[PDB]
Curated annotation (Swiss-Prot), chains A, C, D:
This is Major capsid protein. The lineage of its organism: Viruses, Duplodnaviria, Heunggongvirae, Uroviricota, Caudoviricetes. Major capsid protein that self-associates to form 120 hexamers and 11 pentamers, building the T=13 icosahedral capsid which about 860 Angstroms in diameter. Responsible for its self-assembly into a procapsid. The phage does not need to encode a separate scaffolfing protein because its capsid protein contains the delta domain that carries that function. The capsid gains its final stability through the reorganization of the subunits that takes place upon expansion. DNA encapsidation through the portal triggers capsid expansion and the binding of the decoration protein to the capsid exterior. Changing residue 39 to T: Confers resistance to Pycsar-mediated defense. Changing residue 159 to P: Confers resistance to Pycsar-mediated defense, reduced fitness compared to wild-type phage. It is found in: Virion.
Length: 289, 50, 289, 289, 50
């Protein structure tokens, strides 16, 4: 029947497209197939293992040369659950294909949760989230905005945080700005757009994130808690900071019972957010401070 | 079926099934999803004996 | 065969025996096959079909006449199951005389609460219930009887009750009644029997369960208790409306495991009750004053 | 295909069951045959034969004795019917047989109109309501029931009415009367019940229509007008005159399609009624006097 | 068994089901059931021998 395999293909292709929900996350996905990828090295934090091997490699401090840097880079991803049976008693009515409506919105809120979880997440069962991974670095900085009163907040914030991102990547590759539309309510209908806030299409040009700040493009929408004390921002180079360490995904089991006769579409998903450095991001802040 | 009103159908089935909020979380719903078809006709005549 | 498939086909015949709760259940079981039985039709809704079409046939007043009827008539059921379980694990006793011995009481309390709701149900899930049916046209008309003390429980009340609805019921053909039990108790223990009412059997010669007002099958039963306000009566043309929308046949479903050392039977019923037209039963009252 | 060549012949049996409406059509079928039905004969005026003719078998008054008589025996019903239809595209729910739900009230409304017309007919196309027939004869004889203002609903009224009747009529053998429930409402709920009106049924046994005035199984039903003026009674013998001339058996006329989702089941009727003579019933009044 | 109490009989398979509180509810009744009577033994004696 349906509620079964012939769905899943026509289901995971829907997943293959909101795969591209880009509404915060899009990196180079590490694919997996085992379980943990655990790497036993210290990354880029001074090595840069340059050699003369010849002259004199300054015989004093330090050697490695600074903290740290092995975490270690373990990567067992996260089995992500969604779940919702349907009217599993009524495609005996051979509808084949009310599910083109009736599915996919499951993939909708499913991915809604995915990206929210991705950018606001605890660590566990998922991995971490953005403002959460902001929230132990003291990237909560001070005090570019002031408690959502005299919030006319420009990019001086972004200027000194750009100088914070004058860092070890580049300038403006990638260097982004997942934002808020209230953060846009600062700098949409701004008269400036000083450097650039608007139009930031600007043509249209980059990914789908229009509005840019010297090319710091835009992701708003239902993630930032308001009243000034979350970030307005997400100033992170997408390159150096983070990839996706995914493995599988949907191999949803459309199991049946589940009583009063309905079909447990036990929804699977397996991707990851994980980092390397000490810092990858400062954002906002934009605080009640 | 329901427009998945507000979910929270992600967790890893792990941390919790969180015994507080809520149960739905709120109403609801089931309208349910029905479709009043509407026949929209037409009608014409001439006398084409003329 | 620890509640594999072994009782259910006897539970056919046993469940048929619980069509025997006459107290509500005497109509015509609407057979179903679709989910809904929708009829578009303007039924008893204007005609006056009178043709000779001669000279004429009503041209001034009125047009339709009264509206309309484009309500119209759709008839779906509710499934009416039963939370039902015991324990396959104490089934080791090798007896299994404990089948309808064990069973029936379930299908009992099942149909018990079923037809309870057929007296006392909202119209939804539990289908159409007599108290709501007493309320839906407010044929709870007042004051007939005087709230549990020195009251007017009488057939002259039922006389003018008929002089309401024997307009649109017929006239004791057969046009039944249902009373309450203390409402029975003035017609229990009665001398009167005003016109014809005593006692119940009283002949016996037909069904006519308890009570016989102009030969009436009256129901005591009562899931309609006193509280001074009550449907002390319910004079009703029993064949005007109120079909029973059954579809197919019997459905105990012995869910298997169901662990926790406890069983699981799901004992459905896709019967219903859906009415037909405007009114049909005037009842009460025995208001609370 | 149903509603096609089958349920018509069911509609036959239901029309035989709708002989049964115990209010009106308790007269006498003349099942006519050519078209119009008619014998040659002059109504035999003076016969009252008894061939004595010994001497001059009465040689004084009159010599006919009755002008004339030729009324006469020439009778035809009309094209009576019920229009009926449905949309037959939507009983296709594996039904082919919701005519147990569908018809009946068809046949109800047919005969409902028919005996209604025997309360309320015009003499042409419909034959006659008898209240009409009460009117033309000035059988509405006053003053009896005062205007529903101190109603003098007595049988002394009906006694003078029998002072008309039981001459050419007999006494309560067979003899009848059709009331209103308002008109019964002085004879329901009373003690009056005059020489005999008691009560309704009462033995019960024979044609026992509700109210038993001098042994009259009295039809209530009423499609009279009410309030002050009507015929509260119908002091008649049904067996005096008053036959149904009828023609054929059943015919529903099923030009089926007819599109626009509406059929044509033209449930015909070729029955009638006329009396047989002159005065036949007095009733009223029960006027606005 | 928990026979016919603590109920909540019958299921519509309606909208979003449980509310809740109430439900579960009273006993129930996890009793457990056991049915061994004992020897209710009358015992006359008649002399038949005379």
């Amino acid at each position: 029947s349906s509620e079964s395999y012939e769905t899943i293909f026509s289901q995971r292709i829907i997943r293959d497209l909101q795969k591209e929900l880009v509404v915060g996350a899009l990196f180079e996905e590490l694919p997996m197939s085992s379980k943990i990828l655990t790497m036993l090295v210290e990354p880029d934090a001074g090595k840069a293992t340059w050699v003369a091997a010849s002259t004199y490699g300054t015989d004093t401090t330090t050697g490695e040369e600074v903290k740290g840097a092995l975490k270690e880079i373990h990567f067992s991803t996260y089995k992500l659950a969604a779940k919702s049976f349907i009217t599993d008693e009524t495609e005996e009515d051979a509808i084949f294909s009310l599910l083109p409506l009736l599915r996919k919105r499951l993939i909708e809120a499913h991915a809604v949760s995915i990206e929210e979880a991705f950018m606001t997440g605890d660590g566990s069962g998922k991995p971490k989230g953005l403002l959460t991974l902001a929230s132990e670095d003291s990237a909560k900085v001070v005090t570019e905005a002031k408690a959502d009163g005299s919030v006319l907040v420009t990019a001086k914030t972004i200027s000194k945080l750009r100088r914070k991102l004058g860092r070890h990547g580049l300038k403006l590759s990638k260097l982004v700005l997942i934002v808020s539309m209230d953060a846009y309510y600062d700098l949409l209908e701004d008269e400036e757009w000083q450097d650039v806030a608007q139009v930031g299409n600007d043509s249209v040009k980059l990914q789908g994130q229009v509005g840019r700040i010297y090319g710091l493009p835009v992701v708003v929408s239902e993630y930032f808690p308001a009243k000034a004390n979350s970030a307005e921002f997400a100033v992170i180079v997408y390159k150096d900071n983070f990839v996706m360490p995914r493995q599988r995904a949907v191999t949803v089991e459309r199991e049946r019972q589940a009583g009063k006769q309905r079909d447990a579409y036990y929804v699977t998903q397996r991707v990851n957010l994980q980092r390397y450095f000490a810092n990858g991001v400062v954002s906002g802040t934009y605080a009640a401070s």
